[PDB]
Amino acid sequence: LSEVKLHLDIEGHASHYTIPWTELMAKVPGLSPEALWREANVTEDLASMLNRYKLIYKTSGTLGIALAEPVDIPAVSEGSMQVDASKVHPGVISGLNSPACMLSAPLEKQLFYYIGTMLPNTRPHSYVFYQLRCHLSYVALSINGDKFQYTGAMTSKFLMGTYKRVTEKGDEHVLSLVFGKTKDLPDLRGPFSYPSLTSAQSGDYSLVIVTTFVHYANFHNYFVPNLKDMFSRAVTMTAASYARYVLQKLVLLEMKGGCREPELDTETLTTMFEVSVAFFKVGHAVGETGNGCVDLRWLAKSFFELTVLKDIIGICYGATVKGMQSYGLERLAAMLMATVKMEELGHLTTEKQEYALRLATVGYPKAGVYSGLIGGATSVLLSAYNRHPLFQPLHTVMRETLFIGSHVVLRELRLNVTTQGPNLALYQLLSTALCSALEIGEVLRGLALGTESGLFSPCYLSLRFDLTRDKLLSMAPQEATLDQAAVSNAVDGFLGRLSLEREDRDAWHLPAYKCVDRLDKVLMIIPLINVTFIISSDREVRGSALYEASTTYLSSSLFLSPVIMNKCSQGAVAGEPRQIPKIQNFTRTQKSCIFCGFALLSYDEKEGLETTTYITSQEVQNSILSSNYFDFDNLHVHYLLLTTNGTVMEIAGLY
């Protein structure tokens, strides 16, 4: 090389500076000025330069709008253990309750471990940007048969989503959005300026669009984004909240037919960008704290949301995510899961219950499928089901807590076999008890509108199989203020979300499943201690016993097969089915838990099974008895009782 002096006339007369190459080039290896000097066509005739400047789409205008940055990462907690993500020592953190933050200097090194090309030399970028190669993270997906491609590539400083389409003939229409702090945007190359390319800007943030006028025309046929809201949504929200925002859209969409064959419309392409931002905001807020330390509780939540978002983007688009994962955090989280007694996680406050369940799923990659996490999610559900007024729709706070813990469990049902039969089948039993006509009511309403209620329900992971379409229609919101089309849709998705096949998170994990001849004739499966029951219209069953309530002369059947010790038999019991022994000598006042570990079913002769309760505690029993639950005024409704001894007993009256 050499050294170069720059003599520049500014203010009328010479001012000269000196550029040392040798010196600069050794302090920052990876600088290649001769490669940059090439990328800048320094002998470009102003004719050729102005032609290529008029190839890039310019933005109308639409200068600044007052947007407030939120408060995402809090200041370090009072006297906190600052954890170096590289040196993750055991015992560093004792308990959950102990304050803890993770040093943000070596954490970003793990999130952004990759090095790849951020700015290619492909046609749309070779004109505007100086080529780049840096530490980065990218989400990348492919739809429409590897023809339309998206790559959201990000650093701690700015995000670039790049859309690309192929037209069955070779051509490639490319459009890229650039989001980040203005001063932190990549270096422009030609005569270009960012104000000409800015589609929205607010208080050191900007959204830049980079594409050809031609390519801009192509996309406008099927992609008209609301770039103002996408900017206002991306700036004003916190990293965790925004992450949840995206994953709800995809989770609700996936329950519909929105991901088996996704379309080239505005919405799906928009959400593709929203997906990338959600990963960017987290890595951004971490990198944007400089050398500091990030509250572990904040990390527990933000990266929980990324883990669930990462998952749904994969089972929905088939997307790949490289980066935004730190082994230091996964080791740190797993450490705190050896602090917790999973048998008694539900005994903690419902904030540390959620702080534990969020570390459980952040720390899964290096935890193993034989960790006692299942018991922790089962514990939380039990403490919740005790403090829940029976047959009511779950509250806002409870439904959120259970949603957090559910992902762990769904990684058992969607995991070929397990060793958690006791706890899993208990969680699936309490889930079957929680979802009643009014829980379903609030879910369909929560689905029709799109609110948080339709995201998760214990009915989703329950053992109920009698939920036909017209069965749900008798439970839907009837309010004219709602849209019946959305309510009709909401039923299908809710019915699509439980269809046993092609879902794979429902069944085939219970050892009592074997004793069923026809698997479509089952109605409900209650596992108790030492027994499970298989309620169905199917007759050919290898249960030990077999009962038939007098269902009606309309409906197929109602059979009750108790499987003893979760072991089936060698042939369907023969001869006319048994009779359910009725019980009148039973008083409404008790002082003991005699129905502990017993399920109490409630069905109708025409409608079918209506309500299920599993009596886990003296409180659950007191609620049933002291309340109006026992209503014999309607002759069509009977109240079976499922013991642990395998007997079914109908209560026809009390004292």
Binding site: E11, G12, H13, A14
Partner: protein
């Protein structure tokens, strides 16, 4: 008819002209103008003041010439486009010659050159000025030409001498 005794611009040209002072005066340059290097001698010391910068030709054989005709082409960037004008910036340069029977080689001496005229461009502001002067009668085996700079911002592009026969 015109017989060319010296032509700086053309024909495998400059090849030797002498500068005084060495380095802090006139500068030799190269820059493709249509597609080709056209060479020039320029000096712009417009803010240093008290400039006496010399450029001397090679030795030019007189031949038969009584009176030669000296054709000059040059640009002169005006002083106003340098904020501190009319203080140390000039917009002229001086043409001299010196007759000699012998080649004194590199031994330049400035008290042996006689001034011919002051060269001003007649439109100070694409504006490639063309000035022509004649000197006679020439009475030696040959002569030198010299160009004095007093602090202007000048580029000499063509220096063409001839006589009419």
């Amino acid at each position: 008819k015109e017989v060319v005794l010296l032509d700086f611009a053309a024909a495998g040209g400059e090849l030797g002209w002498l500068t005084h002072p060495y380095g802090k005066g006139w500068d030799l340059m190269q820059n493709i103008m249509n597609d080709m290097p056209i060479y020039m001698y320029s000096v712009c010391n417009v803010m240093s003041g008290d400039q006496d910068n010399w450029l001397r030709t090679n030795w030019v054989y007189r031949g038969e010439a009584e009176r030669i005709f000296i054709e000059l082409k040059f640009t002169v960037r005006d002083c106003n486009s340098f904020p501190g004008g009319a203080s140390s910036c000039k917009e002229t340069f001086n043409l001299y010659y010196a007759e000699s029977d012998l080649d004194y080689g590199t031994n330049f001496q400035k008290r042996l050159f006689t001034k011919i005229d002051t060269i001003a461009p007649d439109e100070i502001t694409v504006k490639l000025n063309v000035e022509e002067r004649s000197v006679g009668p020439l009475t030696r085996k040959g002569f030198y030409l010299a160009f004095q700079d007093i602090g202007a911002c000048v580029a000499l592009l063509s220096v063409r001498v001839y006589y009419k026969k």
